[PDB]
Amino acid sequence: AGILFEDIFDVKDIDPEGKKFDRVSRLHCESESFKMDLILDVNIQIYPVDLGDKFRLVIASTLYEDGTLDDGEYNPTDDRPSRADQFEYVMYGKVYRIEGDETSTEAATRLSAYVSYGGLLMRLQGDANNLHGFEVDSRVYLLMKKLAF
Amino acid sequence: IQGALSAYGTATRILQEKVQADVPPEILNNVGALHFRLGNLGEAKKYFLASLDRAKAEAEHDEHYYNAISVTTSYNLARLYEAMCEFHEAEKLYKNILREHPNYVDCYLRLGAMARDKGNFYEASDWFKEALQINQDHPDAWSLIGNLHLAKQEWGPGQKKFERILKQPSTQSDTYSMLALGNVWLQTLHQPTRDREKEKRHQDRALAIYKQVLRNDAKNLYAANGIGAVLAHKGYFREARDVFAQVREATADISDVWLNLAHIYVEQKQYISAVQMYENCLRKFYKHQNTEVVLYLARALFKCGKLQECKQTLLKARHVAPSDTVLMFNVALVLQRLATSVLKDEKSNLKEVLNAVKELELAHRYFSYLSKVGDKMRFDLALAATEARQCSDLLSQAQYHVARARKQDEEERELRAKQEQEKELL
Amino acid sequence: YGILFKQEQAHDDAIWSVAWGTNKKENSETVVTGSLDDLVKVWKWRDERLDLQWSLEGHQLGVVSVDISHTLPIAASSSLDAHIRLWDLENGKQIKSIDAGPVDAWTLAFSPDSQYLATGTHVGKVNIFGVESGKKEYSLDTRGKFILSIAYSPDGKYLASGAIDGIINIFDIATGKLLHTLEGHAMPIRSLTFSPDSQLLVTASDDGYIKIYDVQHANLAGTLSGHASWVLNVAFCPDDTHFVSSSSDKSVKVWDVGTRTCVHTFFDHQDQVWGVKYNGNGSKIVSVGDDQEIHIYDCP
Amino acid sequence: VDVTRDIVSRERVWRTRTTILQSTGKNFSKNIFAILQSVKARE
16 A cells, blocks of 8 residues: 545635746646645646646555555656556655644644645645654655546 | 537537527436536526427427427436425426326336435325335335335344345346345444454454455455445455545545545544544535534644634534433533543633633533433433542532632732833832 | 624524523523533623623533513523523522432523423423422423423413424413324424413424424314424514524524414524524524524614 | 426426436546455455
8 A cells, every 4th residue: 555645626716826947837726525735836837727626636655555665766668567657747856844733732624735746835734633644754656547437 | 428519519519500400308318417427407408498398399200209208308308306305396397297198117217216305204105115015026115115114123133034035136237235134234333342252253244245345346346335334344444544544545535535534533532534534424504513423523633723612513413403312421421522621730811710600500401410311322321420529529629729719809909000010209 | 674783702602592582571682592512601682782691500411491580670591401400690690400300401491480490301201390499389280292492472371292203282371181182294394482472382393394383172274384494492572572582493484373474584593593582582593503603784 | 288398398407316326526436346255256
């Protein structure tokens, strides 16, 4: 396994402050079941997303189903069956921060894992139970795929 | 539904530049019909009122039949009024169609639904059968018949006959009835007679029903809905998430998937993914505190946020109808779980030892009250004896630990004094 | 026609009822509520402001019913712990604790004479305990399923009860006998109250119709379409001109008792409202529920 | 009467019962019967 997260989101606002770049746009999705936020930047040129689209977003820790935890180098010649074969947009990033509503005494209820995909940021701001397998400085995949419903 | 609206907005104004001609009622009726499905119910109501006023003006439009146009506009208008928290106006509008054209079916079918809210034994069960004698080839009116027998599932095996009436080839194929058969066949599961080679045959029968409605309809979701139910009943929860994934992805806004998916999650010790799935089903504007959800909510909860809080939801459930025995039993089982989690290995706070005995006393009073009730959860509750013995030795352990409470009291008093003297030195 | 006071986070847990006074016996200015967090807060609506005056505790289970005595500035509180504890809004102390065991304890019913207290029993009967006694004085032998609502009349001439299957049981508190049995519903009756004149009887079932029957001849005066969710709480204005309706849909409609029309609706509650009650004069409309937010609705 | 054929001939039914059963999208059974058949051979 290694599925740190899994859900259905739907684009609720596309680049809202105005488009800052040209091949990259902010998607402000919301979730459907766990009721999470998402702020994603996608390569809007090779994978275009329009408003009201719904996609299944699986944040995974590895790509191989058995969870054998690859190294972090790119080797294209590989037979092993992956999870990327049933998705359309796969990214690979590094969680760089985990903010939360901790107080000094009791624990936190809402977390925010900020991961960064080679420069293209993401923030999965939810509640502190779905954000469990996320610890700062760890490599993570994105795996999203548009639902044609 | 926004595109037809954008086209009707401009088609409404494009008919005024050539001449001063009022808009025919036929365009306003459909533009209000689109808004009926939307949240612009008041605006669709003004559209329907104006479509009525315009179609009434057609005194010479006897070829286009203004009368059928006022009939359809008033039909959508009573369909809206039933939905605008106003069944009185919907009854009166639907009766104004009955008084002028008793050969109409939807106005006669929509009247029984309004009384079916007050009970399934009123003029609903009568109007629904009166519509079928006038039109027995109406699959809507005949499918409504089997829906009456769904209130009382005592017609479990006997419903097969009344569902196989319009199973003739002239109606074939009908996915609605064939799937209602698979549903009445699945309801027969969850029984301990599976080793009698009886429920396995039932699984294979419903699976054949589903494979047939699969071969003829690959895009029907309800077909895979029962297949996932049977594969879970076969013991494949690891392989039921994959079958339910295609269903969830297509539309997860059906009340069934939020639950069928939630049972695997509560199955794999993920109440963290199961408790939100139950709250999300309860996000609908139909109730607040259902019994069947909260039954599924407490399954293998042992955690501190899963025992004391589970009592709060249990009380929210019994608040609406305390007459159930299983609520009154589970509120006791959780109470014993909490009391044994403070009076066995704890060596814990002092006020809680005082509160745990009060809870244990209430649980013991409920132990005696449950045992006198006749009917049970299709399972006799004669096994309360182990619970009574647990509460007995719990009383003994509480009387043993209430002295630990006083020992910790003297410990904290001497700690505060030995600190007050250090402060007096300063 | 709006909201005057807005009490944010009125509790830790959801509020299930709300009680407010209508007389001048130090009841109309204090607000007694009972929520599931086991806090019987005594809110003192002083200086047109909702201030906490007392904070009463002791209930094992969450408070199920709160009401102010008519001829008396004291109060009481029931819960599902079969321990109905009497309280006093004069000292914030406990009077007594009727152990209505083992479980048979439901909503309260102050008599207008403030001498009897009705409480539902799981057996179907309506046990009439005595306020200063605590013992089971006399119980109505009308069995069935369960009493889901009990109410006293403002002048004390009749008494009704909501069953689990929509069965109004019109009792006679002057002799203790079942006179009528109104079965115009098949939905579990949530709550009901009597008109200020003891002439109309509203019934809050789970069909979303406000079927206002009559008591004098036991007949229906007219079917009012209520909300789309289940009407939980329903109260009459003291001056008898309107009546409010709490449903389970975040909706505070104020229906007319004469024309059967919504004269105003509130949508300030993010959750479903659980308790509604008038003021002594009927302008301020207090409201509670799962939002744990006490809104004070003015309709001058 | 003619009021029946006056209305059943001009109206439009975009949604009915069987519409509700299929997804609005394109979810064939090649991805369904595959696992459905794989589960029967392991038993």
